[PDB]
Ligand binder design. Structure first.
Ligand code: A1BBH
Ligand code: A1BBH
Ligand code: 1SY
Ligand code: 1SY
Ligand code: Y01
Ligand code: Y01
Ligand code: 9IM
Ligand code: 9IM
Lengths: 319, 324, 324, 319
């Protein structure tokens, strides 16, 4: 469970499997109560599974009709890779297919039923009856890591935080020697609504600006001088300075907001809120394990309901 | 169809629906030939669809158990949104469930068990599907769902690259190039972005090809971003050597997000494989190409270079686009 | 739900689908009670749906005749796009047409004629529907289609008002107000927009309410737009009288697009009725409210006043929002 | 047929009615050939129409379930207005409904068939089978004038062109007296792709800028001084001035482009192109009839494929 903010969803668990197990127990008890012959039960069950497997075969063929066009670009020119992409594993799938064919032909008309199954399966593709529910899609994305926020969080850590955080420790001490000493941490603001104004004082006038740390420079991706700059802010309580820290907005959140505005992005407000929460979770998880963040940085997540933002930083700064 | 590189896949098309239509026509012709009673055909088709709908109901009920745990964080604390996520649409799904229940209870059936026995078996089979994983999507179906939904990481990386870096710098780039030319051969008036589909992206460009060397940088651009008081955007100028003599000079850079894809491959915590890296690298190029095409700020002031290593041509690749 | 005024309609909801679900449940219960053979029920339901699909095919064929004339101008000169526009989706529609033809030819029927006789009658009835206009949409269905598709004129007017005027001026408005206050009681730091749902909008605001009078204008703002070298955006300052003494002063204007709606009502060539004017005027307010809510440039620097005349309160209405 | 550009679609005609008439003739000839009893033909036809009318009644009831919620806001608190909105005209609809009920009950089970019809109609709403085709929607919008471009064109004429064009004649002469005399017309550019750059020279360097006309001022909508300004441009051919005119981009086209970019607008690229063409057509039609445009303005529509834009203005300027 995340410690940043209550609104952050936890990773999905096994609850579906437990519900399926309860359903299995109930179904078996019901079959025991009904008193129908066990052999007929087994026959019907195996026939149903065989029919499902054959429907899977036909759906895979329909998908293969599409994937073969991409054979060169996506599948590097191998027909077998395309076939596996459509069927998952041709060996296991072929074994189950042969078993299903044998059992469905033996146990019982085969040809008429096969045609009826193909007709049913074709309508599923054309009508779209097998479109997955939002929860099913969300679970698939989270397990596979097919998420916008996943890439943004790793991009943020790999590029910015990985480089600057080690140097941050040295730079802050240099500033304190040159100059009221500032806290020895970088504080990152995570607005779950993705506000992120470019001037921090506009967010809260109690946060006012102070001189900058020494610039950090590095050679990167063919640009010989990438300059990394950090600003210092003072926090006002009762109208006087009550804290001083190096402060940031998570810039990737600004990308999520902009994606929500552009029509070409295909990115909605609901996607923005879900991905914003996900971005916080994965960034929290990575920094926990990351060697670079010994004690160097702090994450602050908040959700505006007259807001406390200045007090929010102070609370963690005092903490 | 992408113009950057032959290997970049085109967006998926309707071919699956065309194959489904061919299959449907063939199945109808086969039923016509078989000569079985039409009423039996219709009855059993409807019964199969009804059984599928009931299995969907039960699977959603199983899913609903997990989502109810997240109700407060993921679904705004409302039960209806949870049920909507699990079942897709309560009204349409309820209508189809009523139809399925009515027709399966009412109609005679010889291929399937009576209603209650059938329901017990259907729940048993759905529980087996859930526990064993017998219904998992194929990787091609997952890819189709992701590309239709825009769930890929490369989509987010490309949009971040456009919104943060290019959208700001490209407008100012013309003025900075004119200033550099007037203050000072004259650099070309475009920014050239290199896209290695293998995601190598060395920091020191000289390491990639000795025929590329570094000149004095463009004037720095500064702007206030995300609560940081103004920060530097900088660009480097390079000269290109043909047989050891300058054939061309240009403003040039690697696409930084490709380094993120490569690093994500190395880190175990990322759950990102090398196969994903190549797939997402191609998708990044395709997405960025589409963005810059429509983007008004990027009209003819930007150019993309995409290549894959087969002694490499890199310096010639940049020269090719410059003289073109 | 809009906050501007009680009379502004909320967006349409799902109530129609809920009523349809209630109807479906009642019909299923009625069929259950009637005790007629289930197979007859299923057969005749399927036959009715098949007849509807064939009628749709014929109607699309009739429509296709008109669209083929426009092929080059409206459909890029491609036949497939014309057929797509007429039939919606060739693949899905073809699948359903094959199903309909197969089942109607194959199944026995007592309520309808044999296949060819039925086809002749169905074409006759569809031709009558087209010629007589017997299938025209009700005005409520047209309104639902328009609001779902965003086909209303008020949508375009609101988006033009936001994109052209407010998006530019509102950011500069703060600096202009600060400049006016420093150069010089002090005007409030917000722009107030008046929205008469009757679309009166007189040019001279003093004519609307003598208690409103005009002060020295804000500094002019100039910018280059649409091939015109810089042009003036100007705003007027007003003072508000309570019992003949200044209670408040503000920057204020009528929403110009409402004059367009009123004028469109007067002009015969516009094909725009007074009933449409009131409907679109409310929709304009609702659309603008939604735009400014999400728009980042309009955060707390803009305010909307909406009212309908029942001796009018106008000056008090502005005062209400100022002190609030 | 529009004279601006070939790409502009003409208003839809009667072709559908002619096709329906041909279909009617073919169906009647087919019925004559089949030789089935005419009385059975009439009975079946009337029963089909009656069933369609009853389905219409039930659909109207389902819609009324929704519209009643809006009774106060949209329908000014009248139940009868809501009922008419759902049914179109309760008198004619009730007459046809009573006739349909009578004929369907008399001619033939009624109750079972009525329930089956209701079940069929309910599925149409829930499944959405009656969603109109794009061409049907487009025809409805064009006839009803439910279009974004319709409002934009009238807004452009009512506000800008109506006011300035009369004054334009006087102002141009004033400029010629003060000062190479410029053409006595306003030229408006209509890019069907909705490009519309803010600086015209950027579109084509052969178009260069020249001093402005005297400013026009007016009192408008509570703003005491609305200033209307027009710029003058010179056109280069063979590298020297070859023309001088007052030149404009149609600003509403810029709105269409921006709407295409914003996600909140629900406006696509295809909508942008269709509405851009429609905007040209309606603006062409209105100015033809409008009293104000005696000879004062010219419309130029072009569609970029290295473009001739400067030559395009010259061609019409020479014309
Ligand atoms: C009485 C019943 C009533 C019901 C209605 C039935 C009426 C059927 C009527 C008419 C058919 C339409 C006109 C035909 C002529 C055009 C064809 C062509 O000659 O065209 C063919 C066309 C190639 O063209 P292309 O070279 O341009 O490639 C384009 C590519 O397809 C696009 O791919 P995609 O759409 O995103 O998937 C891409 O997007 C696009 O890109 P770009 O933007 O550049 O244009 C281009 O590349 O596709 C094909 O080969 C597929 C052709 C086969 C698909 C047929 C579906 C199944 C149909 C019927 C079922 C019966 C089958 C078995 C029957 C025997 C019994 C078992
Ligand atoms: C064995 C079969 C398996 C198949 C599945 C069947 C299972 C059925 C199961 C469970 C039902 C769901 C839980 C029920 C408790 C919640 C209800 C509530 O108590 O709630 C009621 C809720 C009011 O609430 P509310 O005050 O919050 O108003 C909101 C409003 O509705 C929203 O309007 P809309 O959705 O855009 O149309 C607006 O958008 C939202 O706005 P906001 O954003 O502010 O929230 C709010 O205003 O609506 C209603 O009165 C409608 C209630 C009736 C609709 C029922 C549909 C027909 C259903 C079944 C057919 C059988 C009928 C006849 C049967 C007898 C035989 C003839
Ligand atoms: N070649 C190049 N030169 C630049 O100056 C530059 N600036 C940004 N970018 C790249 O474009 C995109 C925009 O960055 P964004 O701010 O949205 O996310 C950035 C941002 O959240 C953070 N970050 C990076 N640099 C800074 C910086 N100087 N100051 C504050 N935050 C920074 O870390 C994220 C990833 O940066 P990069 O992974 O190195 O590549 C970025 C990114 O892909 C640049 N690319
Ligand atoms: N109150 C107010 N003060 C202004 O300065 C102002 N400027 C524009 N607008 C209004 O915002 C909207 C956006 O204008 P757009 O340019 O996109 O369409 C404008 C534009 O295409 C054209 N037009 C109007 N004024 C000018 C002008 N000065 N110069 C060139 N074109 C103009 O005619 C259209 C309708 O103008 P109005 O219908 O009177 O109100 C406009 C409009 O509703 C203003 N509203
Ligand atoms: C399950 C199917 C077969 C039958 C359901 C019929 C009705 C009882 C359903 C249909 C749609 C439902 C409504 C759709 C929308 C809403 C808004 C929804 O919004 C909230 O207030 C909570 C969301 C949030 O927290 O933001 C609350 C439930 C409610 C009233 C629902 C209540 C139950 C309704 C009426
Ligand atoms: C009518 C139904 C029942 C059967 C149709 C089956 C096929 C013959 C159809 C299905 C989709 C069609 C294709 C879908 C997409 C295109 C792209 C389309 O694009 C263009 O080149 C013209 C558009 C333009 O002018 O931009 C040309 C037709 C084509 C090849 C179509 C040809 C005919 C196809 C293969
Ligand atoms: C398309 C066609 C003709 C077909 O090929 N099958 C294969 C098949 C099964 F899928 C299932 C069992 C036997 C056969 Cl033989 C089929 C089945 C039904 C049916 O009524 N299934 C209910 C049902 C069960 F019988 C057992 C179960 F465990 C769950 C369940 F939901 C209707 C039509 C068909
Ligand atoms: C739902 C139910 C039971 C019902 O209420 N009707 C009413 C009705 C008609 F709609 C049409 C005719 C008679 C009746 Cl009685 C119906 C009809 C059919 C059918 O086969 N229609 C073919 C068909 C025709 F018969 C004549 C025609 F001019 C065109 C056409 F397409 C199937 C099921 C039903």
């Amino acid at each position: 469970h995340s410690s940043l903010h209550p609104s952050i969803p936890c990773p999905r668990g096994h609850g579906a499997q437990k519900a399926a197990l309860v359903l299995l127990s109930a179904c078996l008890v019901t079959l025991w109560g009904l008193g129908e012959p066990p052999e007929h039960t087994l026959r019907y069950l195996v026939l149903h599974l065989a029919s499902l497997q054959l429907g899977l075969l036909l759906n895979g063929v329909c998908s293969l009709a599409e994937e073969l066009r991409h054979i060169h670009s996506r599948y590097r020119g191998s027909y077998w890779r395309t076939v596996r992409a459509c069927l998952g594993c041709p060996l296991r799938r072929g074994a189950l297919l042969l078993l299903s064919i044998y059992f469905y032909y033996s146990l019982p008309p085969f040809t008429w039923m096969l045609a009826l199954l193909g007709l049913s399966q074709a309508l599923n593709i054309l009508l779209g009856l097998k479109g997955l529910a939002p929860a099913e899609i969300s679970a698939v994305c989270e397990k596979g890591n097919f998420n916008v926020a996943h890439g943004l969080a790793w991009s943020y850590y790999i590029g910015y935080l990985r480089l600057i955080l080690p140097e941050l420790q040295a730079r802050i001490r240099t500033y304190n020697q040159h100059y009221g000493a500032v806290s020895q941490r970088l504080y990152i603001l995570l607005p779950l609504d993705c506000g992120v104004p470019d001037n921090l004082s506009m967010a809260d006038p109690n946060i006012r600006f102070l001189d900058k740390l020494p610039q950090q420079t590095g050679d990167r991706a063919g640009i010989k001088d990438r300059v990394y700059s950090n600003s210092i802010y003072e926090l006002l309580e009762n109208g006087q300075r009550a804290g001083t820290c190096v402060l940031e907005y998570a810039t990737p959140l600004q990308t999520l907001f902009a994606m929500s505005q552009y029509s070409q992005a295909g990115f909605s407000r609901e996607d923005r809120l879900e991905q914003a929460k996900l971005f916080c979770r994965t960034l929290e998880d990575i920094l926990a394990d990351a060697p670079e963040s010994q004690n160097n940085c702090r994450l602050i997540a908040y959700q505006e309901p007259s807001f406390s933002l200045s007090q929010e930083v102070l609370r963690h700064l005092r903490q």
